[PDB]
Design a protein around this ligand. Sequence first.
Ligand SMILES: Nc1ncnc2c1ncn2[C@@H]1O[C@H](COP(=O)(O)O)[C@@H](O)[C@H]1O
Ligand SMILES: Nc1ncnc2c1ncn2[C@@H]1O[C@H](COP(=O)(O)O)[C@@H](O)[C@H]1O
Ligand SMILES: Nc1ncnc2c1ncn2[C@@H]1O[C@H](COP(=O)(O)O)[C@@H](O)[C@H]1O
Ligand SMILES: Nc1ncnc2c1ncn2[C@@H]1O[C@H](COP(=O)(O)O)[C@@H](O)[C@H]1O
Ligand code: NA
Ligand code: NA
Ligand code: NA
Ligand code: NA
Lengths: 488, 488, 488, 486
Amino acid sequence: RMAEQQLYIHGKFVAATSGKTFETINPATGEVLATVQAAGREDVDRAVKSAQQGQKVWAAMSAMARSRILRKAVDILRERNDELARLETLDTGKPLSETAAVDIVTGADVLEYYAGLIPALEGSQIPLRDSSFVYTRREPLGVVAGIGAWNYPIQIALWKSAPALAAGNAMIFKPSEVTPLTALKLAEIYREAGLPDGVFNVLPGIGAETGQYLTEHPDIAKISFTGGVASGKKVMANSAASSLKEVTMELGGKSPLIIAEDANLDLAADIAMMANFYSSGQVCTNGTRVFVPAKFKAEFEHKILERVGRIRAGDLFADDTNFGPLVSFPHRQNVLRYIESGKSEGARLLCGGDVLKGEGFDNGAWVAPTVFTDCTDDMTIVREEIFGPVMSILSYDDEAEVIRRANATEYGLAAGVVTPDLNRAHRIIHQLEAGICWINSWGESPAEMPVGGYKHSGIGRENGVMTLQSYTQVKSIQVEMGPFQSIF
Amino acid sequence: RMAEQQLYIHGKFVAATSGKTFETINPATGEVLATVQAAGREDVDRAVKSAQQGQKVWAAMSAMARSRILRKAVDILRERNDELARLETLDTGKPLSETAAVDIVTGADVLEYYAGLIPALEGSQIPLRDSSFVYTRREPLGVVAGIGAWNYPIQIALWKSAPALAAGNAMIFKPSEVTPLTALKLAEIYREAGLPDGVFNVLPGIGAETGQYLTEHPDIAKISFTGGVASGKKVMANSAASSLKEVTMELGGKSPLIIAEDANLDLAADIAMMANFYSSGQVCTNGTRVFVPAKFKAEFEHKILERVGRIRAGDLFADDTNFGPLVSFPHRQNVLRYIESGKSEGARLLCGGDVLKGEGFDNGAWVAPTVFTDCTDDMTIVREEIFGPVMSILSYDDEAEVIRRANATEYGLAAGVVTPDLNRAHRIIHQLEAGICWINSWGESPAEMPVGGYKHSGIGRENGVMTLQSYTQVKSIQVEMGPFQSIF
Amino acid sequence: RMAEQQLYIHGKFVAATSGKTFETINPATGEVLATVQAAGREDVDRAVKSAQQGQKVWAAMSAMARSRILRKAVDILRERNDELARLETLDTGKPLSETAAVDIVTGADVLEYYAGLIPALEGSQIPLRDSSFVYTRREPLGVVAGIGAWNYPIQIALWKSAPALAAGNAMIFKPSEVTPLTALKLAEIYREAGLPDGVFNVLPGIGAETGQYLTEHPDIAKISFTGGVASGKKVMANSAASSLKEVTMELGGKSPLIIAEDANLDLAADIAMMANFYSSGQVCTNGTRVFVPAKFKAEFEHKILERVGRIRAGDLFADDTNFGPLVSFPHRQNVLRYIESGKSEGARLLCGGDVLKGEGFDNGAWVAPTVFTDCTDDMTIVREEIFGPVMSILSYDDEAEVIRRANATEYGLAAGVVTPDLNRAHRIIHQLEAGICWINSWGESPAEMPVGGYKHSGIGRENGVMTLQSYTQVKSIQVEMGPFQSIF
Amino acid sequence: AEQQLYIHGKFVAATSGKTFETINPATGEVLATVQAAGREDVDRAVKSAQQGQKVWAAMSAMARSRILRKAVDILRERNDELARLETLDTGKPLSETAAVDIVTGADVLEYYAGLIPALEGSQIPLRDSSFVYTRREPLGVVAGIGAWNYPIQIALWKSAPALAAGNAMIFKPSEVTPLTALKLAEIYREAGLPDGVFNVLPGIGAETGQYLTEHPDIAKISFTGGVASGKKVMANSAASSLKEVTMELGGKSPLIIAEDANLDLAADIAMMANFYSSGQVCTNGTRVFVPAKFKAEFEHKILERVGRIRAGDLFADDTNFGPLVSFPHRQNVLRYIESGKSEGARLLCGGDVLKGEGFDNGAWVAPTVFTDCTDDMTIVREEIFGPVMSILSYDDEAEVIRRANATEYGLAAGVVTPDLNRAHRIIHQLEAGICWINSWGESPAEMPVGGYKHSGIGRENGVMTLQSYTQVKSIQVEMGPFQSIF
Ligand SMILES: Nc1ncnc2c1ncn2[C@@H]1O[C@H](COP(=O)(O)O)[C@@H](O)[C@H]1O
Ligand SMILES: Nc1ncnc2c1ncn2[C@@H]1O[C@H](COP(=O)(O)O)[C@@H](O)[C@H]1O
Ligand SMILES: Nc1ncnc2c1ncn2[C@@H]1O[C@H](COP(=O)(O)O)[C@@H](O)[C@H]1O
Ligand SMILES: Nc1ncnc2c1ncn2[C@@H]1O[C@H](COP(=O)(O)O)[C@@H](O)[C@H]1O
Ligand code: NA
Ligand code: NA
Ligand code: NA
Ligand code: NA
């Protein structure tokens, strides 16, 4: 068990003044990983005043001075990749085979990416006439807040903090209460890299309290939130009610994976497996509606069954473990309710559908990888995000039908198509209503690539050059060198 | 009085099914200008279904085909400038000297600007490796909604609809109930120009009902709102509780004009006049806090008194008239309550402070140009936006103080400085917390120049190239040409 | 018979002072179309002084004022498309079925495109520190010179003049002695649209005299040249020996068309036909090396021969004529010399290979559509550009081989691939060393698409936003608001 | 020790059989003998670069970035060592070389390293059934030809964008100052740069430079030097394979002192614009335009400033003035100084070589200021490239602008004024690519720099220069049915 975890405000760990605490569990064992202090309303105010003071120092440095500090943090993250991944595995229940290859690697990639773009952040100059011209500045917002989710804790902390800090802001980050531990380590890493005190503060807490105090605080200029749709609506209401903040939201989806009639079904099955069962299905971009041509549906079902039999649950630190428990018992209960609705609504259970039992599983919230087929667009498991290891296989006859059904949803996060045909790939992808589209692949999210949702799946974008700009605000300045004329 | 005005949906005027109507008044005479039908909850759904159909046609056209249509609308607007300005004067009370020279001219300037940029709206391509690359599409949002304010009715309708249409969207526009007439004329002009049916629909109504139905509709992807802070908080809240929509907001301000000790006080007085009394002070960007060095205050007050003396109120269609009534009698009552708060807190009344009386004024919502001096930061008239012809003059001693006091507000819309000194002009402007900054001028808003507020004065920007992009959404597409590797 | 054509300098036609003239021939009949005056050194000097005066007026105008003038020119060009095309057909010998559908249509498209972009021409602003910043201006170069080629006379004049004028420069344009007539008409159109006098001047003449005087003139800031490699080298030499001009060149190519093993051979044949025999083969981008898999070559040859037999030479104004004479009789001799080298080097003539004879052809510079097969990479007709209707079909065995052979040339202008396979199309195209690449098509050159040559086929680019910027020069301006510190 | 060529990640003997010497300008002694790359050597470097460029371009963008940042870290750690070698080769005080030459060279490499992942093409929809996308592809093999005033900085400013864009560069340093370019090649290899990506071929411009400009497989030339040498480069590149050329030439930059200017500030700016690096800097404000009403005061102030100049041991901390790059170069500067007297200019100071212990053996020229200068004197119209300030008087703003602009040069310009309108108004009318307001000489990596008119072609630094080391490929994907008219 670990020592009690404190708040991180202004370059040092510090006790919360709320008097309150919470515990984070190891979802593989049910054991208390650490007791964690919760930030109260006065603690948030202290963090904002720390952040305001740090931000001025940060913004007054040269662009390359900021770049060098963030690249030093990258170097630390590269060195401690395996140690940080192990803590993430303990806190989240995700296999080490995942956390050591993706979570910190792709989080540091984004920090590294933005560190190098700081000197390229530029305004514009616009001539109006010989006697007047306009120039613009891309100024920091000031203090921004990030609210993280529990499925990719440190990756989210890096994907939010990297552009915010690169744009010259200070960020106060509130990790999920399920998974607060890696965010505290990152705050330590930033200071070791030379980040000025206050520029990145971490306030663990419950959403109902610490999160709400951040969304309500009048001196926070922007909120960036990744999480469930319900917690988002609350953040957006309390942020609307309070000071007028720009909000960015990354929510879930029910993303379609469209298998074309000319597609290799081994490739299609491999893509479908990776689009549904990575991180035990707890991934917003997962391709949970798999559309397969009727003529190949049966063969595809067998290929899935063959691959699902290969999934290896077990010791999360073992190299060959590729499947972990869900993050908590309440989350598994919701997944189990969706599975039962699939059975009751007439979907055909192809495999899985039950909790896992036996030594090593009775203490964690394990669900067997599950596949439903013979699914219809009106079934609950097809219409709603489950956030668990549950694939829905749907049959289709023609391209116009599958495009219509793929788009017939309020979600809009991701989509994909499998096809070797040049025209089919681009033609279909261009008609899909989704922000992240993969052709003959799934899941890769390069730092260069803006990612985010259409419709109800999010507001704004992360990664790419545009996200650096979105953590600045434009000031337009007109220089009038001619004589001003008044009509009064 | 005009025939009962109807909704404009899908290329034609159509009766509302709400059974509700409202009236718009001429603020110069108290007369009813017209009865106007109010869009019901079902009418909004019809407009959305019309906009969905029109947007598909509009987005399928070539970029240059959309450009030519918008440029045709521009040509119609220029030809009908004088006719449109008169209707605007009748509806708003603004002098024809303003409406004929600014409102349609600057509205059409923005439509003309965006018409030419449509073909330059481009995505990006990013190589990842020999075997994979990414490209992005800037796709239309789909159906967007604009909610207009009453101070610049047709200019606002153009500033919202021009980028929205240029980006490939359809807009449903709800004008302010105080000034609904010019937006309906704009819709006929767009159709006459060749805009497909459904791409620009106008639904008059009330904010509590019609505005809310638009902000609640699940198939509207973005809301752009211009108005008061209070209604903006409501819009953001209802849109949050409802479909997760992109939001843009242009709210009020309490913008500071910083007169420097080396400023020509004649130039400063002329800038202060234009920043406070154009459109009878009903302009969000107005410089309603005028900071003057103590050593120059008495002389500046004298020069202000001189410029107020030249103000020429009267018949709104006379060429020499340069001051009009407020937009409505209820708004005048609010402005009078601010004036009484200024007297009761001890601000010195320099001029004005009362309604205008006599033939041709006793029937209009006239307020005399009003200047308070000896003003202090804590006064209500200095802290709150009045949106009337009320200038507040505040004395300051040194630059650091005036920067702090200028910035010590929840508003963030505009700011300005009067100084011949190179270093002073840029140094001050760079430290001011405002999105729109004028050096030795006020009020000019070129189509090329992004405009919008810091802090509580707004979210997002209007005009400039960036606003065309903000009416698109980014779709990232990864083409994987290498073998896909599954870990299962 | 037309009247003698004069020089066009400063908004009017004016007599040359060279005392020298030349004739332009109708290539379908041999008759003299018109006598044209040649500009001497003093004529060029007068043109520069005219251009210098007009550029200042043109650049002092607002961006939108420049945009409206160019769009007015577009409107006249659309109205006069048929009349201009008929003149181009008379001067060049290209069928009206081409000139009325392409030459002015796509010329005006580029002018229309750049007209709308003028207001988006923007500099940048870079904050160095609190006390110093940099901003940049994109200023006009001043007076630039364009030297046109004879195959697309008015299109080239528009593609060069449109970005030059839109960037605020004046252009002196020198048309080819073969095709001077439409350039003089374009000058009249610009004046009628409102272009200031001197901003577009046209100086017919010969390359060795008029062309050299322009390339040598000290007050010309940039040269844009389209033509043969030998003439280009002369331009580059005189420009270096003289004042330090920027040169842009669009020279010839020997562009490969790669037919993949999975391509439909009817599509491949249609693309190859359009890539070789449009404008009688007189196109720099033509796909004159057609690479076909060995196993499909015989079937491809049959499809080519069937299509070549459909080619309709005849009256260039007849609707169904789709093949014209070469631009001149000296050019036909060069093409016939190449055809004889193909025969003598052992290439197999599949069709054509001789002049056309009979009523209607005997007086024209006609060459039959010619196809060689069994070609090898060492043959003269394969290594050198012919600029006539001569296709070379080359067999290949594998993808790596065809990429090497496609790239094994000093030319680098265009290339294309025919394949329905997603991976093959992008993978091959990414390895081809050419600036213009077509997948499953040929010849389309949208205004938005930058076009130009790799290696010896050109310097710089035309069209796209980047070409507007290339007709400006960057001025960087640092504003230092802090104290300057000298080490001396 | 006989310095050799650097090709494919190792030092290699030249196959020319020719050599040259570089002199320490402070002592007249030979610093080192350097081998000169011949015609076979140029073909070798190009063939090596072609092989290396594919490895380099095949890496990820971040892989290239990390290698370039490792080179930066080595350069910082070796700043003092490299600066000393630069001082020996150029005669610039260590106080300069340790603070500017490598510092500002590395800054540009560091800047471009971070931008590699942001180098992006474009995507343009044409219609539902067709779209276009563009790739920004490496040119391949490019060549840089450096000047002698800032040897390593020029090598970094040329090689950084070239390598960042995915090209290999062959760099030919000036024969006057070839030594630091070879250390840089070593540093790049140590940082992990693939072999062949940065090859260095010392030699003579008449031979080695020509062989680079004539080689058919070099896609672009970037040249910094004098106008005459540039015209030769451009001719040979014209007569040869069709190359993109970039040139950064000299200037006769004006420094305009306004009526409301503080003359202490103006004098400081004028000192740094004329006498830094002993006045051998292309952006130097050699024409200092001063109001007649202030000329006498400014002259006093110049004499006050010129008196603090401390010539001496180039490794001494307080030294701020060095010898010229070579004794032959000194004769040309002295030839210009004699022309001001013959042309009637009043010599306010300097104008001779320096003498005594420690100066008789160096290529010293005294800091020189002429006043009573006229627009027609040779020293006012032509670049001297030595420590010679020309003071010119003016009466009205239009005159100084036209006179400032009345030149074929267009490199830099500056104005000294506290007035908002005059700075922007004057600067917007000056025909120069590099304009400083109330300062001089600062050249941030972010700021594009280059000449108007005869002072250069193209630009260096800034994001645009990264793109200019790429070539655009446009690709149309036609998904509709293709229609032939035959
Ligand atoms: N009402 C709320 N206000 C602010 N943050 C919240 C709220 N409810 C939950 N959160 C936080 O939002 C993130 C995601 O929530 P969930 O989707 O419920 O896991 C976690 O950091 C929660 O603690
Ligand atoms: N609650 C609301 N929801 C939507 N629109 C509203 C709401 N309240 C006011 N509006 C509209 O917002 C615009 C400006 O609001 P106001 O500042 O109140 O005049 C007008 O078009 C109003 O009708
Ligand atoms: N030496 C030259 N200098 C300038 N322009 C030339 C020269 N030779 C030919 N031209 C022109 O270049 C264009 C195309 O050259 P060509 O390839 O010979 O048709 C025509 O306008 C020629 O008149
Ligand atoms: N004709 C030439 N061709 C190529 N490079 C040259 C030529 N002349 C001089 N150079 C080189 O150009 C650089 C600067 O030239 P300079 O202005 O003479 O010092 C040095 O590297 C010279 O060796
Ligand atoms: Na946990
Ligand atoms: Na009204
Ligand atoms: Na002709
Ligand atoms: Na030397």
